[PDB]
Amino acid sequence: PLVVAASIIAILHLILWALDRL
Ligand SMILES: CCCCCCCCO[C@@H]1O[C@H](CO)[C@@H](O)[C@H](O)[C@H]1O
Numbered sequence: 732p733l734v735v736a737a738s739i740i741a742i743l744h745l746i747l748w749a750l751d752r753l
Pocket residue numbers: 749752753
């Protein structure tokens with residue numbers, strides 16, 4: 732479950748960064 736949570740947060744953070752860059 733911690734793998735799931737950490738990975739969701741990591742992917743969402745990546746999406747936020749990408750949207751900012753775009
Ligand atoms: C699934 C594809 C997502 C692509 C994410 C692109 C992240 C970088 O994107 C590019 O970044 C440049 C500066 O960093 C900007 O000047 C460009 O306009 C932006 O397109």
